[PDB]
Design a protein around this motif. Structure first.
Motif, PDB file in Angstrom:
ATOM      1  N   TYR A 156      34.668  45.461  44.268  1.00 16.50           N
ATOM      2  CA  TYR A 156      35.131  45.611  45.640  1.00 16.50           C
ATOM      3  C   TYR A 156      35.033  44.330  46.441  1.00 16.50           C
ATOM      4  O   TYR A 156      35.876  44.058  47.281  1.00 16.50           O
ATOM      5  CB  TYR A 156      34.370  46.723  46.335  1.00 16.50           C
ATOM      6  N   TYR A 157      34.004  43.537  46.175  1.00 15.33           N
ATOM      7  CA  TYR A 157      33.853  42.264  46.854  1.00 15.33           C
ATOM      8  C   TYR A 157      35.014  41.365  46.412  1.00 15.33           C
ATOM      9  O   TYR A 157      35.561  40.599  47.207  1.00 15.33           O
ATOM     10  CB  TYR A 157      32.543  41.607  46.454  1.00 15.33           C
ATOM     11  N   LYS A 158      35.378  41.454  45.135  1.00 13.66           N
ATOM     12  CA  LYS A 158      36.470  40.643  44.625  1.00 13.66           C
ATOM     13  C   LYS A 158      37.784  41.135  45.216  1.00 13.66           C
ATOM     14  O   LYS A 158      38.736  40.382  45.344  1.00 13.66           O
ATOM     15  CB  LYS A 158      36.532  40.699  43.092  1.00 13.66           C
ATOM     16  N   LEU A 159      37.835  42.410  45.579  1.00 19.13           N
ATOM     17  CA  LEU A 159      39.054  42.956  46.159  1.00 19.13           C
ATOM     18  C   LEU A 159      39.334  42.171  47.418  1.00 19.13           C
ATOM     19  O   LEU A 159      40.491  41.924  47.759  1.00 19.13           O
ATOM     20  CB  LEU A 159      38.877  44.428  46.544  1.00 19.13           C
ATOM     21  N   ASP A 160      38.261  41.795  48.096  1.00 14.62           N
ATOM     22  CA  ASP A 160      38.349  41.056  49.340  1.00 14.62           C
ATOM     23  C   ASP A 160      39.066  41.944  50.348  1.00 14.62           C
ATOM     24  O   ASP A 160      38.495  42.923  50.845  1.00 14.62           O
ATOM     25  CB  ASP A 160      39.129  39.752  49.153  1.00 14.62           C
ATOM     26  N   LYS A 161      40.319  41.614  50.617  1.00 15.22           N
ATOM     27  CA  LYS A 161      41.137  42.359  51.565  1.00 15.22           C
ATOM     28  C   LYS A 161      41.926  43.512  50.961  1.00 15.22           C
ATOM     29  O   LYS A 161      42.384  44.402  51.675  1.00 15.22           O
ATOM     30  CB  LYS A 161      42.110  41.396  52.259  1.00 15.22           C
ATOM     31  N   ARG A 162      42.066  43.503  49.653  1.00 10.36           N
ATOM     32  CA  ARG A 162      42.854  44.507  48.968  1.00 10.36           C
ATOM     33  C   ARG A 162      42.320  45.923  48.858  1.00 10.36           C
ATOM     34  O   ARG A 162      41.149  46.136  48.550  1.00 10.36           O
ATOM     35  CB  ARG A 162      43.213  43.997  47.585  1.00 10.36           C
ATOM     36  N   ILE A 163      43.215  46.883  49.089  1.00  6.14           N
ATOM     37  CA  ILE A 163      42.901  48.307  49.034  1.00  6.14           C
ATOM     38  C   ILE A 163      43.701  48.933  47.897  1.00  6.14           C
ATOM     39  O   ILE A 163      44.914  49.049  47.994  1.00  6.14           O
ATOM     40  CB  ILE A 163      43.309  49.018  50.345  1.00  6.14           C
ATOM     41  N   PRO A 164      43.026  49.369  46.823  1.00  8.87           N
ATOM     42  CA  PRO A 164      43.678  49.982  45.659  1.00  8.87           C
ATOM     43  C   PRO A 164      43.915  51.497  45.726  1.00  8.87           C
ATOM     44  O   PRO A 164      43.181  52.237  46.386  1.00  8.87           O
ATOM     45  CB  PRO A 164      42.744  49.599  44.514  1.00  8.87           C
ATOM     46  N   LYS A 165      44.940  51.944  45.016  1.00 10.42           N
ATOM     47  CA  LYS A 165      45.287  53.353  44.978  1.00 10.42           C
ATOM     48  C   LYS A 165      44.939  53.946  43.613  1.00 10.42           C
ATOM     49  O   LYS A 165      45.018  55.165  43.400  1.00 10.42           O
ATOM     50  CB  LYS A 165      46.786  53.536  45.269  1.00 10.42           C
ATOM     51  N   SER A 167      47.262  31.188  33.841  1.00 11.54           N
ATOM     52  CA  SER A 167      45.845  31.519  33.695  1.00 11.54           C
ATOM     53  C   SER A 167      44.976  30.633  34.578  1.00 11.54           C
ATOM     54  O   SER A 167      45.474  29.922  35.441  1.00 11.54           O
ATOM     55  CB  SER A 167      45.399  31.335  32.244  1.00 11.54           C
ATOM     56  N   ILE A 168      43.673  30.666  34.334  1.00 12.04           N
ATOM     57  CA  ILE A 168      42.734  29.860  35.089  1.00 12.04           C
ATOM     58  C   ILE A 168      42.871  28.367  34.800  1.00 12.04           C
ATOM     59  O   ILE A 168      42.258  27.551  35.490  1.00 12.04           O
ATOM     60  CB  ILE A 168      41.272  30.261  34.787  1.00 12.04           C
ATOM     61  N   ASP A 169      43.665  27.993  33.800  1.00 13.11           N
ATOM     62  CA  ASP A 169      43.822  26.570  33.507  1.00 13.11           C
ATOM     63  C   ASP A 169      45.178  26.222  32.907  1.00 13.11           C
ATOM     64  O   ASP A 169      45.322  25.209  32.231  1.00 13.11           O
ATOM     65  CB  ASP A 169      42.745  26.126  32.536  1.00 13.11           C
ATOM     66  N   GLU A 170      46.154  27.086  33.143  1.00 10.98           N
ATOM     67  CA  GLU A 170      47.501  26.924  32.617  1.00 10.98           C
ATOM     68  C   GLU A 170      48.481  27.070  33.758  1.00 10.98           C
ATOM     69  O   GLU A 170      48.201  27.764  34.722  1.00 10.98           O
ATOM     70  CB  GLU A 170      47.799  28.040  31.610  1.00 10.98           C
ATOM     71  N   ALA A 171      49.632  26.428  33.652  1.00  9.01           N
ATOM     72  CA  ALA A 171      50.658  26.576  34.667  1.00  9.01           C
ATOM     73  C   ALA A 171      51.943  25.917  34.187  1.00  9.01           C
ATOM     74  O   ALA A 171      51.922  24.836  33.586  1.00  9.01           O
ATOM     75  CB  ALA A 171      50.208  25.979  35.989  1.00  9.01           C
ATOM     76  N   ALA A 187      22.816  21.359  20.384  1.00  8.68           N
ATOM     77  CA  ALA A 187      23.907  21.247  21.331  1.00  8.68           C
ATOM     78  C   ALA A 187      23.422  21.736  22.696  1.00  8.68           C
ATOM     79  O   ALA A 187      22.388  22.405  22.791  1.00  8.68           O
ATOM     80  CB  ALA A 187      25.072  22.078  20.855  1.00  8.68           C
ATOM     81  N   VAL A 188      24.146  21.397  23.757  1.00 10.69           N
ATOM     82  CA  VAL A 188      23.723  21.850  25.073  1.00 10.69           C
ATOM     83  C   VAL A 188      24.386  23.184  25.366  1.00 10.69           C
ATOM     84  O   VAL A 188      25.623  23.291  25.357  1.00 10.69           O
ATOM     85  CB  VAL A 188      24.113  20.851  26.176  1.00 10.69           C
ATOM     86  N   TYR A 189      23.569  24.208  25.600  1.00 10.55           N
ATOM     87  CA  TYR A 189      24.094  25.536  25.915  1.00 10.55           C
ATOM     88  C   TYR A 189      23.971  25.881  27.405  1.00 10.55           C
ATOM     89  O   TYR A 189      22.876  26.005  27.932  1.00 10.55           O
ATOM     90  CB  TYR A 189      23.394  26.606  25.072  1.00 10.55           C
ATOM     91  N   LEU A 190      25.112  26.044  28.065  1.00 12.30           N
ATOM     92  CA  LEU A 190      25.173  26.373  29.491  1.00 12.30           C
ATOM     93  C   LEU A 190      25.775  27.742  29.785  1.00 12.30           C
ATOM     94  O   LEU A 190      26.739  28.166  29.144  1.00 12.30           O
ATOM     95  CB  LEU A 190      26.026  25.336  30.221  1.00 12.30           C
ATOM     96  N   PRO A 191      25.215  28.454  30.766  1.00  8.48           N
ATOM     97  CA  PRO A 191      25.765  29.771  31.101  1.00  8.48           C
ATOM     98  C   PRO A 191      27.085  29.549  31.840  1.00  8.48           C
ATOM     99  O   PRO A 191      27.232  28.589  32.612  1.00  8.48           O
ATOM    100  CB  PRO A 191      24.699  30.371  32.002  1.00  8.48           C
ATOM    101  N   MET A 192      28.044  30.437  31.585  1.00  9.83           N
ATOM    102  CA  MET A 192      29.353  30.364  32.222  1.00  9.83           C
ATOM    103  C   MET A 192      29.288  30.552  33.747  1.00  9.83           C
ATOM    104  O   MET A 192      28.775  31.553  34.246  1.00  9.83           O
ATOM    105  CB  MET A 192      30.277  31.428  31.613  1.00  9.83           C
ATOM    106  N   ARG A 193      29.800  29.577  34.481  1.00  8.72           N
ATOM    107  CA  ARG A 193      29.846  29.661  35.935  1.00  8.72           C
ATOM    108  C   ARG A 193      31.314  29.776  36.338  1.00  8.72           C
ATOM    109  O   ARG A 193      31.927  28.827  36.818  1.00  8.72           O
ATOM    110  CB  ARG A 193      29.209  28.422  36.561  1.00  8.72           C
ATOM    111  N   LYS A 194      31.871  30.959  36.099  1.00  6.86           N
ATOM    112  CA  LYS A 194      33.266  31.285  36.390  1.00  6.86           C
ATOM    113  C   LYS A 194      33.769  30.898  37.801  1.00  6.86           C
ATOM    114  O   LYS A 194      34.879  30.383  37.959  1.00  6.86           O
ATOM    115  CB  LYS A 194      33.452  32.787  36.168  1.00  6.86           C
ATOM    116  N   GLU A 195      32.958  31.160  38.823  1.00 13.41           N
ATOM    117  CA  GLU A 195      33.346  30.840  40.193  1.00 13.41           C
ATOM    118  C   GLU A 195      33.609  29.351  40.387  1.00 13.41           C
ATOM    119  O   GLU A 195      34.565  28.963  41.063  1.00 13.41           O
ATOM    120  CB  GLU A 195      32.274  31.318  41.174  1.00 13.41           C
ATOM    121  N   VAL A 196      32.762  28.517  39.796  1.00 11.35           N
ATOM    122  CA  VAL A 196      32.942  27.084  39.908  1.00 11.35           C
ATOM    123  C   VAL A 196      34.223  26.633  39.219  1.00 11.35           C
ATOM    124  O   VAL A 196      35.031  25.921  39.817  1.00 11.35           O
ATOM    125  CB  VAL A 196      31.782  26.326  39.267  1.00 11.35           C
TER     126      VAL A 196
END
Ligand code: DTP
Ligand code: CA
Ligand code: CA
Ligand code: CA
Length: 341
Positions: A273-282, A103-107, A71-80
């Motif tokens: 923190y990079y994923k936080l982008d603009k967000r500041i957590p407490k 979710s990432i594919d539900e609505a 089978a073809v095994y590919l690494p997960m590219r979540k960002e894409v």
DNA sequence: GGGGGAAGGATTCC
DNA sequence: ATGGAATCCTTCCCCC
């Protein structure tokens, strides 16, 4: 109220097929390599070609290769997959003002103020499937009913590349025919607690004395089930808001040594923190997965926002609290930021 | 007695 | 046997 639930077929894998249709037809397995040893890790998901042989989400990659070594095994590219997802969601956002991205594919979509009876819902269902397929070359399953829960159940019953309607009449039958282990939110743990209570079907919740339920599974879960059984479940569709961001990585080898873990933890922080982008957590929680795949965590909420420097120092403190409060060796380590200002 | 929080854990699911 | 995130439960705590 009519709810139209949309779920993209084998998403991660179908996207990899999209970005390289030569894959279509062959077994495709998107993997998450833990980097502990050659093929260590688990399967994020696989297409139906590979899934027909048992290769599915959750099983070790090594178990997948022993079954479908070619089978073809590919690494997960979540960002894409995430960006492709967004585009499709925007698409849906045009069929209704009311959209809940579960979710990432539900609505779920509230098409009440857009349709009369289920016939018009069905058409809209196809019309949407077609759209997404023509726009992004992605097949999805559509489920429709009076409320979210059933809308979802409808889709599950029609997977993949399907569409189904569960009208008020059939809703009656399922509340009696549906195994309650097929009710969203009912995993193995709750399933077995419901089996020991004589509740195999939704309706069985009607027999049981409330207080007994609340004690075995909890009030929230109890009220939830009862509502569904009474055909009175009816939660509204609303925009969900990201409440926490964080990352957890698997360590090459299992440690209990501060200095050995730190680098892994710091990396989790940086990315978080990079994923936080603009967000500041407490709030910040240090999460650790012990050798015997158990999960231990420690956190702390500050009366203000946490800077990267503060998260670094605190993270090390919380990790130390874990190393001194638990004896096991730590396998995975990470952070979780929440309570955004 | 009970209104908050905060913390650590349990469950589910994508 | 990866990894991200929401929700809910229990418990402890502070105090009116
Ligand atoms: N155990 C898991 N580990 C990592 N990612 C997962 C896991 N389970 C699901 N996902 C992710 C990848 C899936 O493609 C994605 C989207 O929906 P999901 O229902 O979970 O799978 P799927 O797209 O393959 O559904 P379907 O059964 O319709 O093919 O969620
Ligand atoms: Ca899916
Ligand atoms: Ca899904
Ligand atoms: Ca289930």
């Amino acid at each position: 109220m009519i709810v139209l639930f949309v779920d993209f077929d084998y998403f991660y894998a179908q996207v990899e097929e999209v970005l390289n249709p030569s894959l279509k037809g062959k077994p495709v397995v998107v993997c998450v390599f833990s980097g502990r040893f050659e093929d260590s890790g688990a399967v994020a998901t696989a297409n139906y070609e590979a899934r027909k042989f048992g290769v599915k989400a959750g099983i070790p990659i090594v178990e997948a290769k022993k079954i479908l070594p070619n089978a073809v095994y590919l690494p997960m590219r979540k960002e894409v997959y995430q960006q492709v997802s967004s585009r499709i969601m925007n698409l849906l956002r045009e069929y209704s003002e009311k959209i809940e991205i579960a979710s990432i594919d539900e609505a779920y979509l509230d098409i009440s103020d857009k349709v009369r009876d289920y016939r018009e819902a069905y058409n809209l269902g196809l019309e949407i499937k077609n759209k997404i397929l023509e726009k992004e070359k992605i097949t999805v399953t559509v489920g429709i009913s009076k409320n979210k829960v059933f809308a979802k159940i409808a889709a599950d019953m029609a997977k993949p590349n399907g569409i189904k309607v569960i009208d008020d009449e059939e809703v009656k039958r399922l509340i009696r025919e549906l195994d309650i282990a097929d009710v969203p939110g009912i995993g193995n743990i709750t399933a077995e607690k419901l089996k020991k209570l004589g509740i195999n079907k939704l309706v069985d919740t009607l027999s049981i004395e409330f207080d007994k339920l609340k004690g075995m599974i909890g009030e929230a879960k109890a009220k939830y089930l009862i509502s569904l059984a009474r055909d009175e479940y009816n939660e509204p569709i609303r925009t969900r808001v990201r409440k926490s961001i964080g990352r957890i990585v698997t360590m090459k080898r299992n440690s209990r040594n501060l200095e050995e873990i730190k680098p892994y933890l710091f990396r989790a922080i940086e990315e978080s923190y990079y994923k936080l982008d603009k967000r500041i957590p407490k709030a910040i929680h240090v999460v650790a997965v012990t050798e015997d795949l158990d999960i231990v965590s420690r956190g702390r909420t500050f009366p203000h926002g946490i800077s990267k420097e503060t998260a670094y120092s605190e993270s090390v403190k919380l990790l130390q609290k874990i190393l001194e409060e638990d004896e096991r060796k730590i396998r995975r380590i990470g952070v979780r930021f929440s309570k955004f200002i």
